[PDB]
Amino acid sequence: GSSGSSGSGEKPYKCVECGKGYKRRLDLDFHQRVHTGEKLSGPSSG
Ligand SMILES: [Zn+2]
């Protein structure tokens, strides 16, 4: 089947890239960052 995670709690703000939901905008505003771009990785596995 194609069931999904039963999310609980409605949020006023919701991302536009993924569609997430944050109680406080500030929180989301910082989330969108992941959609814009973020450099974390670096060293190659070995
Ligand atoms: Zn998002």
UniProtKB/Swiss-Prot annotation:
Disulfide bonds: none annotated. A zinc finger (C2H2-type) spans 13-35. Ubiquitous. Mainly expressed in fetal tissues. It comes from the Eukaryota. May be involved in transcriptional regulation as a transcriptional repressor. The DEPDC1A-ZNF224 complex may play a critical role in bladder carcinogenesis by repressing the transcription of the A20 gene, leading to transport of NF-KB protein into the nucleus, resulting in suppression of apoptosis of bladder cancer cells. Interacts with WT1. Interacts with DEPDC1A. Belongs to the krueppel C2H2-type zinc-finger protein family. This is Zinc finger protein 224.
